[PDB]
Design a protein around this nucleic acid. Sequence first.
DNA 1: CCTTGACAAAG
DNA 2: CCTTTGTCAAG
Lengths: 68, 73
Amino acid sequence: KALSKLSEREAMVLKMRKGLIDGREHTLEEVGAYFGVTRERIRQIENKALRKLKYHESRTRKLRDFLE
Amino acid sequence: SEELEKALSKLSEREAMVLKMRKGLIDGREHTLEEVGAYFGVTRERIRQIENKALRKLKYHESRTRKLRDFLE
DNA sequence: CCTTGACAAAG
DNA sequence: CCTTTGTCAAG
């Protein structure tokens, strides 16, 4: 399950969308096609992966941040 | 798939780290060339150079092997 | 591998 | 009005 960790697919969705795979940013449509899924599911997966990254210590790290 | 992440794995860690940071794959937040510069201790222009090389590597490999485009195109 | 200085845009 | 970002050309 994980509340702060990313699954193989979540990270891949991110790498493909942001251009980490071939230097080209890809549309939700293309990524969905790659995953035999809908462009909307990609968008969803994309969003959940980001929250896992934000929250992931980052959000709660803000108090320790004020001290650096 | 590690298979499609071939070129991305041949980038330097620094190069990879720069892309991840700029794009927000580290903490969900997109960072400025300046913030990344501050991270690695160099100017935003330098980071800009590094980022540019990294992408150039990815596009080049992609245009030579045609991994993703043989599928999309 | 790196920094400067001058800009356009956007804020 | 002044500042931040991302670019460029040189070195």
